[model samples]
Target: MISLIAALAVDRVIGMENAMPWNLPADLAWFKRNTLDKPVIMGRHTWESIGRPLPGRKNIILSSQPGTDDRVTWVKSVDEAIAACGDVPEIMVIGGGRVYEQFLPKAQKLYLTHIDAEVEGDTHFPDYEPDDWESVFSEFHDADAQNSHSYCFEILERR
Candidate 1:
């Protein structure tokens, strides 16, 4: 299955300059551990922000300009990305906003972090009405000392 997972705020901003505004260490760790064995795909900017392919996983990045990284196989189209994944257990659509918008219709599930605080910038997740998808799981993360961001992790399936 192809899943879309992201920790975004009410403002729909996924980044500032080029990276996440706050470093949620736990969130980052959880993201890495959960998607460790899966195939992950993203746009060039997303790839640049994350640096390189994560170990123990298949990594494919889509970009018009290429030839700089051995750790990641770069592709120019979605079809190529899918081809690069090639019989993997799963394909994860890691994002940069535009990447998500393009992959939205193809995603089977979402691991979304609905943040209570809104970002004050430019990116946004695609809009999906409640009737459009079925909620398979819902977990709320309360605001606290460890994770200052109050967010909800919802696992949704396309109806």
Candidate 2:
């Protein structure tokens, strides 16, 4: 299954100045835990923002940015990135708005963390039809010392 994952504010803002608008350690940990050792595809900016390849996961980058290493695979398109995952049962399309937009239509599932507050951002998550997907699972958490924002983690399966 093709799964897309993101943490966005109430207004669907995912990033500001190419970085996450909020700092939520819990949400970051959740993303790391779920995506570990998997094929995680992202845009060049997303990869750059992270600064390094995510350990234990196959990092597939979609960009014209050159070169490759033992840990990184650079491809030119979303199709190439997905194809690079080969027989892997689940491929993760982790973000930057453009990459997410490209795969949104084909995604089988979405793992989203909805931040309760509206935040400022230049990047936004792609809009989808609520009728096209169903929330199969969810967990809500109140803001605490470790997590600065109230958020809900939801698993949405396309119908």
Candidate 3:
């Protein structure tokens, strides 16, 4: 199974200047819980933003230039990243905007965190037909000390 995971604002904005616009610990924890022990594919920018290989998961980075890190495997293309995952039961595409746009059509599942606020951003999640997906899991978290904006965690399966 191929899945794309992201946290986006109500306007579908995902990032501004290569960083998340909001600071939500709950959402960060949620991301860690779901992606732990998975083979995660990310674009070069995402990898740079993250700084290092994620501890438990296999990090596969899509980069045009070869990297020398033994901790993460670098691939030049999306197809190469998929091939590097080999027999993994699920391949998680953790991204920046371009990567998400590329994988949106092929993704079978979506792990989305919808933030209540609309914010300015230079990067946005790719548009997809809502009718093509069915929500399999949905949960709302209220804004609190740990999180500034109310958000919904939703998992959608392609219909």
The number of the candidate with the highest lDDT is 3
Tell how far residue 121 is off in model 3, in angstroms.
0.5
TM-score of 1: 0.91
Q: List the residue pairs that clash in candidate 1.
A: none
> lDDT tens digits, residues 10-105, model 1?
766676774555546667766787688898888888887877578888888888876488877889898888888988667888897889999889
Per-residue CA lDDT of candidate 2, range 41-151, in tens? 999888888888888999999888675554699998777887899999899999989999999998999999999988778888999887999999999999998777799
Stretch of 10 with least lDDT, candidate 1: 17-26
Q: In candidate 2, residue 52 scores what lDDT?
A: 85
Those runs of model 3 whose alpha carbons end farther than 4 Å from true positions after fitting are none
| Candidate 1, residue 88: how far the Cα is off, in Å | 2.6
Displacement of the residue 127 alpha carbon in candidate 3, Å: 0.4
What is the Cα-based TM-score of model 2? 0.94
Q: Report each candidate's C-alpha RMSD, comma-separated, in the order given.
A: 1.6, 1.4, 1.2
Worst lDDT 10-window in candidate 2: 14-23
